[PDB]
């Protein structure tokens, strides 16, 4: 019984909030990512990095506050508080974007700690760690979007900023510059997310509407005992219904619940891979055959050519304000516009 | 339009003329489908995590369930014991009917708002 | 001619589309919300030009 | 003197249908990008 | 349309090779 084993006993005590060894990584980092976001969206500006207001103190609301990315002139600096840019000056650190790397890096390590928590708790309780495994997709997404994507670009400036409307800007940037809707890795991601919502709703509704009558009340929730051995709904009747409604149905309860893990998890993983491509601007931007025909044939038009004209509008109308460090000056006469508008 | 790229054109022009991203019903639709995919994974992984040992390691664990069997193939008390400790005890369901009603309600209500 | 400005948009595989770009194109803006069944057209050729199939579908 | 570690492999008909569906739908998705 | 000529063989093998693999596994499962 050394000090290590005694520390291990106290870390793994059954308390209201389980701690564990993983808690030593998880709680400091999660609390500081959280607290850093709340601090920045309440009090901190984006004036010197972006030319934007971004806090409640400046008059923004919940939708328009953000902790914004640092200026493009910072490259991929860690922006340490004691590092060479801020030099330990907290006020200047805030003004230069230091809270962004602060949240992003503590957040990455917080996610690691949360997954380690899933492993730790599963092992103590004696269950398989499929839930830790499912959490790799959020991690894949976070790392690809917030770290890998800006590491391949010029600077952290182009990562997502931590805010509601800032993320909408990110969405629209990816349409106008990357044509990301056309990307098959995003299309698989879409299918996995909407298919997961579909599975979530169809499974819950099926169970609720094939329940056995295990009580006399009209609220059916009381007629379930968590220690009962018996299934609470009828797999046999659920199966017949969907077989005759839709043609096929699940028949294996284990395959069904494994499928529910698999579909959204695989979807996020595929979308992560497409974003790694966009780190290098390896877009699925065009279809070459369409461009060759369109360039030669002014009467050829498809929904693909129409969408590029939209992308061209997004780029030219949003770039001067969105990338102020470039000092884009576009005279009115070069802005692409259709008739009248 | 009835097409893949036509859908995208519809979405882009819609954002131009309605600022749908800044509309709370669409924001609720995103919570509906993100949430649905999250809870789909959660429920899938938690039931899978607590399957009862019924097979050897050279067979698919799926063969541990037989179509129409009376007993459950997973230990919901174990799943609750894991998930209650992952968050805290009362953030976790112990009533299968309440849990599955939640699974139905969240994405359905979310997509009502986006529609 | 989805937009009623005599600018036909090609939506079908045989007219130079692939799976990702192809579509059944919405009916002409000149039609608005008017009902446009096949039998209101002077010909199938007219019905096709103006986006009849979209309404039917 | 045969090897004791050999095992038969299995694919049931449902898994064939699922797997054939995955492949065909993946081909339908990527074929446009292959033709470009 | 001026498409990539190797796209036909790429698509063809993309379908054939994994499909044949599954069919092989399935038919030998049935015959045992």
């Amino acid at each position: 019984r050394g000090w290590f084993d005694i520390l291990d006993d106290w870390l793994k005590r059954d308390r209201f909030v389980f701690v564990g060894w993983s808690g030593i990584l998880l709680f400091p980092c999660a609390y500081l990512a959280l607290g850093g976001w709340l601090t920045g969206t309440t009090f901190v500006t984006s004036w010197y990095t972006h030319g934007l207001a971004s806090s409640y103190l400046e008059g923004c609301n919940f939708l328009t506050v953000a902790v914004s990315t640092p200026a493009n002139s910072m490259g991929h600096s860690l922006l340490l508080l004691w590092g060479p840019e801020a030099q330990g000056d907290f006020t200047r650190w805030c003004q230069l974007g230091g809270l962004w790397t602060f949240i992003a890096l503590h957040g990455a390590f917080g996610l690691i700690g949360f997954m380690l928590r899933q492993f730790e708790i599963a092992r103590l309780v004696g269950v398989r760690p499929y839930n830790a495994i499912a959490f790799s997709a959020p991690i894949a997404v976070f790392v690809s979007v917030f770290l890998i994507y800006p590491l391949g670009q010029s600077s952290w400036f182009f990562a997502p900023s931590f805010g509601v409307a800032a993320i909408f800007r990110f969405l629209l940037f990816f349409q106008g510059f990357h044509n990301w809707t056309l990307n098959p890795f995003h299309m698989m991601g879409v299918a996995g997310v909407l298919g997961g919502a579909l599975l979530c709703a169809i499974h819950g509704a099926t169970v609720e509407n094939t329940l056995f009558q295990d009580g006399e009340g009209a609220s059916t929730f009381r007629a379930f005992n968590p220690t009962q051995a018996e299934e609470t709904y009828s797999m046999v009747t659920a199966n017949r219904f969907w077989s005759q409604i839709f043609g096929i149905a699940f028949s294996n309860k284990r395959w069904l619940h494994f499928f529910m893990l698999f579909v959204p998890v695989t979807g996020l993983w595929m979308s992560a891979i497409g974003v790694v491509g966009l780190a290098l601007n390896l877009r699925s931007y065009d279809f070459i055959s369409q461009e060759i025909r369109a360039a030669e044939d002014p009467e050829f038009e498809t929904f693909y050519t129409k969408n590029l004209l939209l992308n061209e509008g997004i780029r030219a109308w949003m770039a001067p304000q969105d990338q102020p460090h470039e000092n884009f000056v576009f005279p009115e006469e070069v802005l692409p516009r259709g008739n009248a508008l | 339009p009835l097409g893949i790229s036509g859908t995208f054109n519809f979405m882009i022009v819609f954002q131009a003329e309605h600022n749908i991203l800044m509309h709370p019903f669409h924001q609720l639709g995103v919570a509906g489908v993100f949430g649905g995919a999250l809870f789909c994974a959660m429920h899938g992984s938690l039931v899978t995590s607590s399957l009862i040992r019924e097979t050897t390691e050279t067979e698919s664990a799926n063969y541990g369930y037989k179509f129409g069997q009376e007993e459950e193939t997973y230990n919901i008390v174990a799943a609750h014991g894991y998930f209650g400790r992952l968050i805290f005890q009362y953030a976790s369901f112990n009533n299968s009917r309440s849990l599955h009603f939640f699974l139905a309600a969240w994405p359905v209500v979310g997509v009502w708002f986006t529609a | 001619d989805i937009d009623g400005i005599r600018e036909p948009v090609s939506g079908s595989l045989l007219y130079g589309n692939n799976i990702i770009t192809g579509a059944v194109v919405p009916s002409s803006n000149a039609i608005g919300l008017h009902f446009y069944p096949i039998w209101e057209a002077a010909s199938l050729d007219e019905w096709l030009y103006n986006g009849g199939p979209y309404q039917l579908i | 003197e045969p090897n004791p570690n050999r095992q038969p492999v299995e694919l049931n008909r449902t898994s064939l249908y699922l797997g054939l569906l995955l492949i065909l739908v993946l081909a339908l998705l990527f074929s446009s990008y292959f033709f470009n | 349309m001026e498409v990539n000529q190797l796209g036909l063989i790429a698509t063809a093998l993309f379908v054939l090779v994994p499909s044949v693999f599954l069919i092989i596994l399935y038919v030998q499962t049935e015959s045992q």
Binding site: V236, N239, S243, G247, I248, A249, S251 | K66, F67, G68 | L13, L14, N18, I19 | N12, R13, T14, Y17, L20, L21, L24, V25, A27, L28, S31, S32, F35 | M1, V3, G7, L8, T11, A12, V15
Partner: peptide
């Protein structure tokens, strides 16, 4: 050739629908 390829793949999928439904492994109460 690309049109034929798209339609061929689509047609195989519809054929798969037919077998998946009408020639499934029947769910038996075991």
């Amino acid at each position: 050739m690309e049109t034929i390829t798209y339609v061929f793949i689509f047609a195989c999928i519809i054929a798969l629908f037919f077998f998946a439904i009408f020639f499934r492994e029947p769910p038996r109460i075991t």
